[PDB]
Write an enzyme that holds these catalytic residues in place. Sequence first.
Site, PDB file in Angstrom:
ATOM      1  N   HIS A 116       0.824  -1.208   0.000  1.00 31.32           N
ATOM      2  CA  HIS A 116       0.000   0.000   0.000  1.00 31.32           C
ATOM      3  C   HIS A 116       0.861   1.263   0.000  1.00 31.32           C
ATOM      4  O   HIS A 116       0.500   2.274  -0.615  1.00 31.32           O
ATOM      5  CB  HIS A 116      -0.932  -0.037   1.209  1.00 31.32           C
ATOM      6  CG  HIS A 116      -1.560   1.283   1.517  1.00 31.32           C
ATOM      7  ND1 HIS A 116      -2.769   1.682   0.977  1.00 31.32           N
ATOM      8  CD2 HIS A 116      -1.126   2.318   2.282  1.00 31.32           C
ATOM      9  CE1 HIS A 116      -3.050   2.902   1.403  1.00 31.32           C
ATOM     10  NE2 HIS A 116      -2.070   3.311   2.194  1.00 31.32           N
ATOM     11  N   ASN A 149      -7.079   3.647  -1.752  1.00 36.71           N
ATOM     12  CA  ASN A 149      -6.143   4.725  -2.051  1.00 36.71           C
ATOM     13  C   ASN A 149      -4.804   4.096  -2.413  1.00 36.71           C
ATOM     14  O   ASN A 149      -4.141   3.497  -1.559  1.00 36.71           O
ATOM     15  CB  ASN A 149      -6.032   5.638  -0.833  1.00 36.71           C
ATOM     16  CG  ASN A 149      -5.174   6.861  -1.088  1.00 36.71           C
ATOM     17  OD1 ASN A 149      -4.372   6.891  -2.018  1.00 36.71           O
ATOM     18  ND2 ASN A 149      -5.327   7.877  -0.235  1.00 36.71           N
TER      19      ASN A 149
HETATM   20  O1  LIG Z   1      -6.210   2.433   2.930  1.00 36.47           O
HETATM   21  C1  LIG Z   1      -6.946   2.882   1.988  1.00 36.47           C
HETATM   22  O2  LIG Z   1      -6.963   2.287   0.841  1.00 36.47           O
HETATM   23  C2  LIG Z   1      -7.577   4.241   2.038  1.00 36.47           C
HETATM   24  C3  LIG Z   1      -8.744   4.551   1.321  1.00 36.47           C
HETATM   25  F1  LIG Z   1      -9.403   3.499   0.685  1.00 36.47           F
HETATM   26  C4  LIG Z   1      -9.337   5.833   1.231  1.00 36.47           C
HETATM   27  C5  LIG Z   1      -8.665   6.887   1.889  1.00 36.47           C
HETATM   28  C6  LIG Z   1      -7.465   6.636   2.607  1.00 36.47           C
HETATM   29  C7  LIG Z   1      -6.893   5.298   2.710  1.00 36.47           C
HETATM   30  O3  LIG Z   1      -5.825   5.054   3.420  1.00 36.47           O
HETATM   31  B1  LIG Z   1      -4.557   6.001   3.290  1.00 36.47           B
HETATM   32  O4  LIG Z   1      -4.021   5.827   1.942  1.00 36.47           O
HETATM   33  O5  LIG Z   1      -3.647   5.490   4.289  1.00 36.47           O
HETATM   34  C8  LIG Z   1      -5.210   7.379   3.634  1.00 36.47           C
HETATM   35  C9  LIG Z   1      -6.156   7.960   4.706  1.00 36.47           C
HETATM   36  C10 LIG Z   1      -6.725   7.661   3.295  1.00 36.47           C
HETATM   37 ZN   LIG Z   2      -2.064   4.973   3.309  1.00 38.99          ZN
HETATM   38 ZN   LIG Z   3      -5.854   3.487   4.782  1.00 41.27          ZN
END
Ligand SMILES: O=C(O)c1c(F)ccc2c1O[B-](O)(O)[C@@H]1C[C@H]21
Ligand SMILES: [Zn+2]
Ligand SMILES: [Zn+2]
Length: 230
Positions: A147, A178
């Site tokens: 990620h 994300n």
């Molecule tokens: O972990 C995810 O995939 C995720 C998401 F699906 C939507 C928004 C966020 C996410 O995590 B992050 O990249 O850490 C960030 C706070 C934001």
């Molecule tokens: Zn993240």
């Molecule tokens: Zn996240």
Amino acid sequence: YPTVSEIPVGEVRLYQIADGVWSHIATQSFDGAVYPSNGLIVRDGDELLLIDTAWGAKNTAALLAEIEKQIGLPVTRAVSTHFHDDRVGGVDVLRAAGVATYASPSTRRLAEVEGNEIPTHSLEGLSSSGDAVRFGPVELFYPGAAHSTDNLVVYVPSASVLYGGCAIYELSRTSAGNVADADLAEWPTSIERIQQHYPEAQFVIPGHGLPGGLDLLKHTTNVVKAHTNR
Ligand SMILES: O=C(O)c1c(F)ccc2c1O[B-](O)(O)[C@@H]1C[C@H]21
Ligand SMILES: [Zn+2]
Ligand SMILES: [Zn+2]
Ligand SMILES: [Zn+2]
């Protein structure tokens, strides 16, 4: 398990997984939609170890208040599992409350570059894929880039609980979350390192949403590979 519909705005819920092991669940808006987010709390004698903030200063203050109401032991250390705001957002609140905040040097550097809050202490011994270190009642593991390039996972040996953070998706997520800072090329290999290192895990917690078993690792690989091909 607490869901979005059960959590008012700016509030935090706790879910006891085992003796002295809880997840914390908060919610936050992102691009107009509301997301749940998980972290971990692990009892460390008569103290608590916190894994991840509750995604923002307000939520993290509410997290400390809910811990006091439901547990009543002091949070003395916190670990952030990567540099994004669901993991470090609220570090300043933790520091002002007297919590010692920790992250890898990679996470601290990326947080500084990104303009996010910066944990104070640096966790050594986690800079190469496959590295593991003990930290009080947990083991910290760097599986490789997924990620994010710096993402850590956390294992609780006394309870067989694996906290995957944002590198692990819940079953309800069937397309990419994300991925702005993700390493799609390495993400399945990093998940395989998690599977190989923690094949005994019984309770797997994603960064967002409902826990499950080790099936969440295969699920995340399936979704990430599909995204790579799309
Ligand atoms: O972990 C995810 O995939 C995720 C998401 F699906 C939507 C928004 C966020 C996410 O995590 B992050 O990249 O850490 C960030 C706070 C934001
Ligand atoms: Zn993240
Ligand atoms: Zn996240
Ligand atoms: Zn699946």
